[PDB]
Structure formats: C-alpha cells, structure tokens
Amino acid sequence: SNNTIAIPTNFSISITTEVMPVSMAKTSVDCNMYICGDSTECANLLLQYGSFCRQLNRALSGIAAEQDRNTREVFVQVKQMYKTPTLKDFGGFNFSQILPDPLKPTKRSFIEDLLFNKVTLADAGFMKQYGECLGDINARDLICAQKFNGLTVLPPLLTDDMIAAYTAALVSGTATAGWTFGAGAALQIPFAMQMAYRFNGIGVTQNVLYENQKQIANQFNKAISQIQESLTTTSTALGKLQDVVNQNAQALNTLVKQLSSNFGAISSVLNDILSRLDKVEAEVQIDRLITGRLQSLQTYVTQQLIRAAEIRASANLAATKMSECVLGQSKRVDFCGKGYHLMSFPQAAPHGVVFLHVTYVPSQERNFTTAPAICHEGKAYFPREGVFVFSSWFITQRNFFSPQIITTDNTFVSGNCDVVIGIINNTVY
Amino acid sequence: AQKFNGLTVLPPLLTDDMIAAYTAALVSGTATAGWTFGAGAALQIPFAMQMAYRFNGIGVTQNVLYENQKQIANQFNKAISQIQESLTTTSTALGKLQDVVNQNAQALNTLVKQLSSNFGAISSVLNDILSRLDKVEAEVQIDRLITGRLQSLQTYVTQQLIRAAEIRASANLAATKMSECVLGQSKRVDFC
Amino acid sequence: SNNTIAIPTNFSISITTEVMPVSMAKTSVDCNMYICGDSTECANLLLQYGSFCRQLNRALSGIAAEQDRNTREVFVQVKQMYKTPTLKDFGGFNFS
Amino acid sequence: LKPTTFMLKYDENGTITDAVDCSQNPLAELKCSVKSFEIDKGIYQTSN
Amino acid sequence: FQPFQQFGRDVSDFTDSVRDPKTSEILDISPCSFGGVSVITPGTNASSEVAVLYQDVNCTDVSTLAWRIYSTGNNVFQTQAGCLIGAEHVDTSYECDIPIGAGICASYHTVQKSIVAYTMSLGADSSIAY
Ligand SMILES: *[C@@H]1O[C@H](CO)[C@@H](O[C@@H]2O[C@H](CO)[C@@H](O)[C@H](O)[C@H]2NC(C)=O)[C@H](O)[C@H]1NC(C)=O
Ligand SMILES: *[C@@H]1O[C@H](CO)[C@@H](O[C@@H]2O[C@H](CO)[C@@H](O)[C@H](O)[C@H]2NC(C)=O)[C@H](O)[C@H]1NC(C)=O
Ligand SMILES: *[C@@H]1O[C@H](CO)[C@@H](O[C@@H]2O[C@H](CO)[C@@H](O)[C@H](O)[C@H]2NC(C)=O)[C@H](O)[C@H]1NC(C)=O
Ligand SMILES: *[C@@H]1O[C@H](CO)[C@@H](O[C@@H]2O[C@H](CO)[C@@H](O)[C@H](O)[C@H]2NC(C)=O)[C@H](O)[C@H]1NC(C)=O
Ligand SMILES: *[C@@H]1O[C@H](CO)[C@@H](O[C@@H]2O[C@H](CO)[C@@H](O)[C@H](O)[C@H]2NC(C)=O)[C@H](O)[C@H]1NC(C)=O
Ligand SMILES: *[C@@H]1O[C@H](CO)[C@@H](O[C@@H]2O[C@H](CO)[C@@H](O)[C@H](O)[C@H]2NC(C)=O)[C@H](O)[C@H]1NC(C)=O
Ligand SMILES: *[C@@H]1O[C@H](CO)[C@@H](O[C@@H]2O[C@H](CO)[C@@H](O)[C@H](O)[C@H]2NC(C)=O)[C@H](O)[C@H]1NC(C)=O
Ligand SMILES: *[C@@H]1O[C@H](CO)[C@@H](O)[C@H](O)[C@H]1NC(C)=O
Ligand SMILES: *[C@@H]1O[C@H](CO)[C@@H](O)[C@H](O)[C@H]1NC(C)=O
C-alpha cells in the first residue's frame, strides 16, 4: 500500500532452545603398544621411527589441552559464585525448574537432569581395571579392546558438578542483578524493574510491562512448562552432542579394527610371522606391518585435528553467545533467537551448553491510516520513529498500539507544507 | 575420464530456480514490509516511510529524506545502473566463485592423472602385469599398486575436508550477513 | 584544532557489492573402480582393505550432506513465499 | 556353486546363524558395502 | 570349540583363545601390559622428584602398603583421577597450578619443598541480597 499501516495490538512471550557443542573427548596413544604389542623384536625395529610418534603425540596433546581451554572459555565468565536464592518467586516468574533444588540429592536442575538423560555415553568413569577387563572377557568390551591396544581416553579437568555450579551461579546472578554484573560489580534490582528495562530496550514503554505483569509471567511459566514437556518426550533435540560422542567412539573402534590388514605381508599376526620365519625375512614382514600401522595412526590424528578445529569454532561462537545474550541484551537480529531478544539462560549438557532464549513477539495486527507528516498553521510536523495513525489523528509507537494525542512534545517542526509529499492537514495541541 | 575411473559428482538438493525464487521472495518481502518480517508477522508499509525510518536509524531526521526524496531516488537508480554496467563489462568480480569451481575440477583431474605412477612396481598397467607374470609375483606388484592408489585417494579426501571447513566458515558468515543486513538495519561498523 | 568543527552539508547514496562462497561440489568415489578397474584378481586382493574405503566414503558423504546444509541455512530464511509485486515503482525507486 | 562375496554372522556362541549374499540385489550390495545387517531410512550411494 | 577348531581370534585377528593339546581345556589369552600412567614434575631445573598418577588403579584400601604400580612410597592415596603416588594431600583450595584431572590440581609448596595435591577452587564466595 501507500497510505495505510499495520500495528500490533498484542504480544506473546516465546522461549526457544539452541544446542551447541563445546568439547570432545581427549585421547592419547601408546605407539609401541598399538604397533608392536608385547614383541621385543618389533619394539627394537620401531626405534628408527621415533620422530613420527613424537609428532603424533604432540598433535594429540595439543588437542587435549584445547578441549579444557574451550570448556573454561565458555563457562568461566563470572568472578563471584553467586549463591542460589532460597525464594525462587521473583514476582510471579517461576525459576525453580532451571535452578538446583536443595531437597533433591542431585546438584543439577530438573531441565539439566532431562538433558543429561537424553544423551547416552559408552562409559562415564574413565576408570577400567585390569581385573575388570580380565574376568568379563565373554562380554567383548569395546573399551577393553581399545585399552589393550594402547588407546586411552583422559578425563576432563572440570567435572559435571563444577560446570553445573557455574551455570547455577550465572542464572542466580542474572536473576538477582540482571546485566550490571559482567560489566563491573553486581548491582541487585527487582525482577519486575529488570523486565521493564528490557522492554524499554526493544522500543516498548515499560508501562506495558507493568500493566500486563500477570499475563507476561503466566506466559513465561507456560513457555517453561512447554520446554520441559518437550524435553521429557523422546526426540532428537540433542543430535549434535550425540553425534559428537558417536564420531569419537567410531574413530577409536575403526582404529582397533584396522589392525587386521596384512599391508602386503604374509600375515597380519606378528606371533605367526615370528613362529614361522627366521630373523632375516621376519624383519621384512615386520617392516611392512610397521609402515601400515603407522599410516593408520597418522590418519586418525589428521582427522582428529580437523574435528578439533570445527569444535573450537563452535566453542568460540558459544562463548560469544554467552557474553552477548546471557550477560547483556542483544540488538543483533536473530542472534539470540527469533524475535526481539529479552534475555537468555544457560544450561549445561554433555559436552556442550544449551541456551534458552526469551524474546518478544508482536501479534494481532490491526489496520490504520497513516500520514508522513501533518500541516498546522502552514508548518510541517514530523514523527521521530513514531507513526501518525487515524483511528481523529494520534501518534503511536510502531511495536505496540498506544495512541497518543499529538502535541509539540512528540512532533518535530520543519519547513512548510509544500515539499512534503502526502502531508495531511491537522491541528496540534 | 573421471566417470570411467569411478569418480562421481552429485547434484545439489535445491535447484537454481528454487534459489532464485527464495531471493525474489526476500527482495519482495523487504520492499513491501521492510524489517518487521523476520521478527514475526510481516507488516506492510510504504517505501518512503520505510526509508524515513532507516534515515532515523543513523541519526538523521526524516524530514531530510522527505524533502530530498527525488534526489535520493535518482541517486539510488544511478547506483543500480552503475552496478549493472560494471557487471556487464568483463572483469574478475566473481573470482572467488570461479576459483572454487577451478579447485574442485583440478582436484578430480589430478586424481585421474596420478594413476600413471608405478609406486615401485614393474609397471602401472594391471593388464600388462597380469599378462606377463604368474599369480605369485603378480600379487606382489598388485599389492604395491593398491597401496599407492589408496594413498592417493586418502590425500584427496583430506584436502576435501579442509576445503569444506573453509567453505562452511564462509557460509556461516553469509547466513549471519543475511540475517543482520537484509532482515534488519545494522550498526556494526563496516559489517554491511 | 580545539575550537572548530567540520559538519557535512550534503550526502550521497552508495551501493557496493560483496561476493561470498556458500557451497562446493558434492562428490563420491567407487574404490574398486578407481583402484582395480575391471580386474577380478585385484578386486579379490583389495578385500582386506575395506575399512579404509568405508572411512573415505564416510568422510565424503558427510561433506556432501554439509553442502546442502550450508545452502539451506543461507537461503531459507523466510516462511512465506511472498509474491513478486506487479508494480515495481515504490515511490521512484526502480526495483525492476 | 559360484565365486561370490558373503557376509557371515557369528553369534554369542561360535555358530554361524545368518548371512548376506552381496550379489543378490542392490539392498544386499548396500548391506555389504556398509558391513551391517540393518540400514536406517535414507538414500545411499552404492557401487557404479 | 568344535572338534575341528584349535585357535580363536578376535576382530583385530589377534589370537585370543586356544585349546590345550593335552587336556582339551579351552584357555583365554590376554595381554600383560595395560593401564594409563602420567608423570607430574615441577621442572627438572627445580627438582628431580616426581609424582606418578595411575589411571585404572584403585588404592582406597591401602593395606598392602598385587597392585599394578611401579613403586610405592609416602602419601599413596586415591583421587577422582586415579591412584596418586608421591604427593601430599592438603585440604586447602588454591587456583589450579598443574591440572591433574577431575577437579584435582597439583603444586610444589614449602612443607623444604614437596609436591602437593588438592581440589581446585571455582571462585571467590559472595552473598548478594535479592
Ligand atoms: C492478548 O492476548 C492474551 C492471550 O490470548 C489475552 O489474555 C486473555 O485475557 C482474558 C481476560 O481478559 C482471559 O480470559 C483469556 O484467557 C486470556 N487469553 C489467553 C490466556 O490466551 C489478552 O486479553 C489479549 N489482549 C491484551 C491487551 O493483552
Ligand atoms: C514452580 O513450578 C513448579 C513445577 O511446576 C511447582 O512445583 C510443583 O508444585 C505442585 C503444586 O504444589 C506440586 O504438585 C508438584 O509436585 C511440584 N513439582 C515440583 C517438581 O516440585 C512450583 O510450585 C511452582 N512455584 C510456584 C511459586 O508456583
Ligand atoms: C547535494 O548535491 C546534489 C548533487 O550535486 C545537488 O543536487 C543537484 O541540485 C541541482 C539544483 O540545486 C540540480 O540541478 C541537480 O540536478 C542536482 N543533482 C546533480 C547531480 O547535479 C544538491 O542540490 C546538493 N545539496 C543538497 C542540499 O541536496
Ligand atoms: C526501470 O529501469 C528499467 C531499466 O533501465 C527501465 O526499463 C527500460 O525502459 C526503457 C524506456 O522505456 C526501455 O527502452 C528499455 O527497453 C527498458 N528496459 C528493460 C530491461 O525493460 C524501466 O522503465 C525503469 N522504470 C521506471 C519506472 O522508470
Ligand atoms: C549358546 O549355547 C548355549 C548352550 O546351549 C545356549 O544356552 C541355552 O539355551 C537354551 C535355549 O534357549 C536354554 O534352554 C538353556 O537354558 C540355555 N543354557 C544356559 C546355561 O543358559 C545359548 O542360548 C546359546 N546362545 C544363543 C545366542 O543361541
Ligand atoms: C596326555 O597324557 C597326560 C599325562 O598322562 C594325560 O593327562 C592326565 O590324564 C589322566 C587320565 O585322565 C588324568 O587323571 C590326569 O590328571 C591328567 N594329568 C596328569 C598331569 O597326569 C592326558 O589326558 C593325555 N592327553 C590325551 C589327549 O590323551
Ligand atoms: C575402590 O574400592 C573400594 C573398596 O571396594 C571402594 O570403596 C567402596 O565403594 C563402594 C561402592 O561405591 C561404597 O559403597 C563403599 O562405601 C566404599 N567403601 C569405602 C571404605 O570407601 C571404592 O569405591 C573403589 N573406588 C572406585 C573409584 O571404584
Ligand atoms: C487491512 O486491510 C487490508 C486491505 O486490503 C486487508 O487485506 C487486511 O486483511 C486488513 N488487515 C486486517 C488485520 O484485517
Ligand atoms: C631454576 O632453578 C632454581 C634452583 O633449583 C629453581 O629454584 C628456580 O625456580 C628456577 N629458576 C627460575 C624458575 O627462574
């Protein structure tokens, strides 16, 4: 059109989820174990390749350190471990489900428990004893095979309890002080005033928030409940974290399986070679096997490096999102969810983080007749990011219909009524 | 030659017609509703008022836009015309896309060419080996060839992975630019 | 200086271009074809290397899926297929 | 009998209880090419 | 084993079981070396003493002080990251100097100086009144 406008008259509170990988498994390789097993002849022959193995382990250890670096950069963004408030009301906004419950044994929140239940891991102890492996042979444990072939998985520096403590501190800090903390010293403020400020940050007056507080709180609680129900229902919401786990496990298992290749030797079994052949020919066969197995290890390390680069990019994005959506209110379109960003809450998850974005969504648009400017006593009056609307003529904000009587307070005088195209004649109080 | 040596190129899911339809939809949506669509339900508005809002967004009153509308429109049209003429003239403005194409083609053709290496065998021709030698020694020679060709394929795949990571970074940046420059007005200096 | 300022009195509208790659070619490989051609002896000898070829093809298929993912993420950012308006004037701004 | 590639399954005991004949049809070819008796929904590249 | 089978093999083609040729009993064969080991050092420039961390060894009940460790000593004790030998446990919490894993960190402190291990601190404590 050219003479009419559409203005929302209502709004809804929307909460959506964003899942981001942060870290992957840290691994280490015993070259001698993987290549030669317990064979002293093979171990002696392998000595002339020490440089390659040192290079491989240098790369792997770099990756391992980078994983802990990623986790720290994402989650350690607060200097004070703010205590979880005892009363979780905050003017009708029910926070219980996202904060830990003192009654329950777990140190996590309910939604965090759901998230940790939705991802399945091969093992969580990082401890497998020789007696355990030798005594459950009938099970044919993949971890036992990996370990017996010299492949180790190291535990992360920060525990799940510590990560959950950091997330609880972040949620409590935002709920009690808002955004002032993270730019200096935390300054506490009531949650209603905080929400009023956030509303003001998206071009809506805070009278709206204060006059619709009960409705807004009810909508927030309902959105939280919907998230909880959806997470309870089985789905593939954490597919990214799941396939990170799966990729690591598959890489290690493939490495184990590749030991069965001959690589052109008479056999793939060192014991068979050494039982049948004397030293001279055994050396040729063993050299072929060493070459092949070293190549396999190098391929594993290369693919690990590429995966680690991808994970690091994801972790950097996650840290930026923490800073710009959790510790402040963002104006970047579609960065902190869809809609006009209000505020975000983080939650820990296996190998990653989950952001809950809370945004403002206009709805129920109505028609009005609009004019670029109004002529009064031969003088042209313009708006200042408002719009003129004909119910009489009024001035209103573009995100919520609140018609107001025109006056010199809310109008900008400029020129006469000749240049302006489409100007209508009116009076100004 | 590529196909006869077992290398295939697959078609993309979305066709050029569908991509062009999406771009046309985006342009029409911005021209008819501005920035409201993308944050919720599209809200139509006249283009002059939309431009006045955009002017207001950079610290300039909208009386300026309304009082210089004809000059602003003429300058916009002239800029469009200059872009069109520059694109018509032959140049290297699309060098990035051209070199993406060139890199993919070169990788495949190098893969085809590398089949002529002996890798230490008496010949690089399986038919020659099998016509001259009995099974026992033919096996040794063929094992050498298999090792070499497998290594060639692995090198190709590794370089493809690295190129793909670079392309993915560029695509993420492009998506961010779509969201922040096309669907809204940005304040980040030199971003849009 | 310390007591004077410079203020613009006019302006110009500038339009510039930015070119960005989004996707590259999706490819697949037939190990047996590439390595052995039509030779049954070589095909039989190649069987003990199936793991490496499965690994290669897994990587390539991942890349192939990622390309379509990139294109969708860049271009599918609207829920309604807004129709092209018949009149392309828009108050003097020529969109044709 | 004919020369062919089979994929045999050994169970918890040492007994072969199932097999896949890789040359029977395209689905069998895909099963042998991914080395698994089960396939998820989707589209997969097979041999030329 | 069936009567015509003498050896068994795993997915890696390693020979993992065999029938005894005299009694016909079936035996499993397992490797001897197993388990992860780490070395903690304050720097050779400072000292030649080290601490050793055995992942996959449980030392909670130190009553034999058949453990799979190279050597025992003073201050052998269990931590969330495994069996630690050669470090003294202290109850105070400091900033992580040498991260061992699973929330444990080691340092080189004046008792004479020795290697100490502790639980890392997560940050200073605060009380904000909502
Ligand atoms: C905006 O929409 C909300 C939600 O639909 C409206 O809230 C309704 O309020 C009435 C009482 O006035 C309740 O009986 C309804 O159940 C509410 N609707 C719900 C919960 O969906 C609200 O009235 C609308 N208008 C404004 C100005 O907010
Ligand atoms: C915040 O929400 C929680 C969860 O919905 C409420 O706790 C539930 O309260 C009902 C009613 O007393 C009980 O039947 C449920 O068993 C409670 N669930 C849990 C998980 O504790 C809680 O009451 C709400 N808070 C407020 C102030 O309304
Ligand atoms: C800003 O510069 C433009 C372009 O030079 C001026 O617009 C010109 O105005 C004159 C009359 O004053 C016309 O004859 C020309 O056709 C206009 N355009 C050009 C390209 O020459 C404009 O007057 C200057 N000042 C302002 C305030 O806009
Ligand atoms: C918008 O620009 C286009 C392209 O310059 C104009 O279309 C041209 O109009 C001229 C004059 O009538 C014709 O000779 C050309 O053949 C047209 N070109 C094409 C590609 O259609 C169009 O008229 C302009 N629109 C307005 C409203 O001025
Ligand atoms: C492996 O063989 C054993 C021994 O025959 C099987 O175990 C018996 O199975 C039968 C049939 O189900 C049961 O009636 C017996 O009670 C089982 N014996 C024991 C000691 O559990 C076993 O089922 C076989 N495994 C498979 C996968 O078929
Ligand atoms: C091989 O000879 C040995 C030694 O005689 C046999 O082992 C003994 O067999 C007897 C008769 O069953 C048992 O009572 C003994 O306990 C076995 N051990 C020893 C150390 O005497 C063995 O059975 C013979 N093997 C075969 C396959 O005939
Ligand atoms: C190391 O072994 C000891 C001795 O068995 C374990 O200590 C017991 O663990 C059980 C199972 O959690 C507890 O119920 C007992 O209370 C523990 N006893 C004591 C005296 O602490 C210990 O858990 C084992 N360590 C690991 C890491 O598995
Ligand atoms: C506003 O008026 C237009 C006139 O075409 C109509 O199509 C549209 O539905 C109206 N909007 C509402 C919310 O009724
Ligand atoms: C190196 O040696 C001294 C003497 O052992 C040690 O105490 C000191 O810390 C080291 N020097 C440094 C760290 O500059």
Residue numbers in the entry:
A (entry chain C): 677 to 1067, 1070 to 1107
B (entry chain B): 821 to 1012
C (entry chain B): 677 to 772
D (entry chain C): 244 to 291
E (entry chain A): 532 to 596, 605 to 650, 658 to 676
Q: Which of the paper's sentences describe this entry?
A:
Further, 007 and WIV1 are recognized by antibodies isolated from SARS-CoV-2-infected patients. Previous studies have also demonstrated that the presence of a fatty acid in the FABP is responsible for regulation of the “up” or “down” conformation paradigm of the RBD, whereby presence of the acid ensures the RBD remains in the ‘down’ conformation and loss of the acid appears to permit adoption of the ‘up’ conformation. These structures reveal the presence of linoleic acid in the FABP of all three SARSr-CoV glycoproteins. Remarkably, the maps reveal a conserved network of water molecule coordination of the fatty acid inside the FABP. These waters support the acid within the pocket, in addition to a single putative hydrogen bond formed between the carboxylate head of the linoleic acid and residue R382 of the spike protein, at distances of 2.4 Å (SZ3), 2.7 Å (007) and 3.2 Å (WIV1). All 45 N-glycans are displayed as cyan spheres regardless of carbohydrate composition. Although there are two N-linked glycosylations within the receptor binding domain, they are both distant from the receptor binding motif, with the closest glycan approximately 9 Å from the nearest RBM residue (Ile-415). Further, N709, N1134, N1074 and N1098 are glycosites on the distal end of S2 near the transmembrane domain of the SARS-CoV-2 spike and are conserved in WIV1 (except for N1074) and SZ3 (except for N1134). However, 007 lacks all of these sites but N1074. Of the civet spikes, SZ3 may be more closely related to SARS-CoV-2 than 007 based on glycosome comparisons. The fact that all trimers were captured in the RBD ‘down’ position further supports the role of linoleic acid in stabilizing this conformation and recommends targeted delivery of linoleic acid as a viable treatment avenue against future zoonotically-derived CoV outbreaks.
SARSr-CoV spike proteins cover the coronavirus membrane and are exposed to the solvent environment in preparation for contacting a potential host cell, undergoing a suite of conformational changes to bind the viral receptor known as angiotensin converting enzyme 2 (ACE2, in the case of SARS-related coronaviruses) and mediate membrane fusion. Each spike is composed of three identical monomers containing key domains involved in restructuring from the pre- to post-fusion state as well as in receptor binding. These include the S1 receptor binding domain (RBD) and N-terminal domain (NTD), the S2 fusion protein (FP), heptad repeats, and the transmembrane domain (TM), among others. Here we report three novel structures of SARSr-CoV spike proteins belonging to bat SARSr-CoV WIV1 (hereafter WIV1), and civet SARSr-CoV SZ3 (hereafter SZ3) and SARSr-CoV 007 (hereafter 007), at resolutions of 1.88 Å, 1.92 Å, and 2.10 Å, respectively.
